């Protein structure tokens, strides 16, 4: 199938571009308190979220040779009422089609951020109450109508200052696959 090859190549070049947008370097200066990013777990789509108070790694991994360099970045997602019901269950749930729940701070892993956009919302102090934390949500759904073509992302070529070679190779490969897609 022409489209099967097309799809496969497209999504391989897709998977290639990341792991450079979220790293211990070229990323942590961007994770501002108010930056807008994405979160993509296996089979889970939370939506949009606002980074808040990313914290230094609490290394506990017995990797026996590595330095356990995973970072815990905290974002403000609307995961689930069902998931805030039980605090002891170490798991989150994506946004159900049901009642829209409440906003809470989820310390997701850096390797989960699919995209790191440029739109940076203003964050209010005193994010302890439940009502003002909804003021963020109504602001998010604001920007999504200001840009009806999707929120602009941060291409690492010109905007993040990525100077490596492999990412350039993958960019060339995806451009080639795109120009090949014209002949469907």
């Amino acid at each position: 199938v022409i489209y099967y090859k097309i799809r496969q190549q497209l999504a391989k070049l897709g998977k290639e571009i990341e792991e450079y947008i979220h790293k211990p370097k070229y990323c942590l200066p961007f994770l501002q308190p108010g930056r807008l990013v994405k979160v993509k777990n296996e089979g889970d789509d939370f939506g949009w979220g606002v980074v808040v108070n990313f914290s230094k790694k609490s290394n506990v991994k017995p990797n026996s040779g590595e330095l356990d360099p995973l970072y815990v970045v905290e974002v403000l997602l609307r995961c689930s009422k069902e998931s805030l019901k039980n605090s002891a269950t170490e798991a989150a749930k994506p946004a159900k089609p049901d009642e829209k729940g409440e906003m809470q701070v989820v310390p997701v892993l850096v390797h989960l951020l699919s995209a790191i956009s440029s739109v940076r919302l203003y964050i209010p102090k005193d994010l302890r109450p439940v009502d003002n934390r909804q003021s963020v949500l109504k602001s998010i759904q604001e920007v999504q109508k200001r840009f009806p073509d999707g929120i602009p992302l941060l291409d690492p070529i010109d905007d993040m200052g990525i100077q490596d070679q492999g990412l350039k190779k993958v960019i060339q490969k995806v451009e080639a696959f795109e120009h090949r897609m014209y002949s469907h």
Partner: protein, 152 residues
């Protein structure tokens, strides 16, 4: 030679950035610029073109009156994005006249694209960052597949 043609119409649009001429900056913690404002058109908030200047003028005198409670500390910082403003002037040119952060303010949005520089990748001791307050009882993260990490 499309690039030779291109390398002439670019530096034209780059006129806004000036780097006027050879300056003599005998210091790097008090000399050099502070920040460059690009006042936009069709903005009724341009009537405050004087209060902004008064603020940026009182800022240096407040930094002077708050010089320090003398303590020995390097307080050094690096640059996330090294894109320094162009220089059409036919001494220091790296630790000064270098955009560290550039934002495009909106009525409620922002367009930050360079971020504040960090010290030892730790936002907990930097000079500019400020973390809000929150409860944070959400014991144990949800990692990916079989990668449960005992954070605590």
């Amino acid at each position: 030679e499309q690039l030779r043609a291109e390398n002439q119409e670019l530096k034209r649009k780059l006129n806004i950035l000036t780097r006027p001429s050879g300056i003599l900056v005998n210091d790097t913690k008090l000399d050099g610029p502070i920040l460059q404002i690009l006042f936009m058109n069709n903005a009724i908030s341009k009537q405050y073109h004087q209060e902004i200047e008064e603020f940026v003028s009182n800022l240096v005198k407040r930094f002077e009156e708050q010089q320090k409670n003398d303590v020995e500390k390097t307080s050094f910082n690096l640059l996330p994005q090294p894109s320094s403003i162009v220089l059409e002037e036919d001494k220091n040119n790296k630790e000064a006249f270098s955009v560290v952060g550039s934002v495009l303010y909106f009525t409620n949005f922002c367009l930050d694209k360079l971020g504040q520089p960090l010290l030892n990748e730790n936002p907990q001791l930097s000079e500019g960052w400020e973390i809000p307050k929150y409860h944070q009882v959400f014991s144990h993260i949800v990692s990916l597949e079989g990668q449960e990490i005992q954070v605590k």
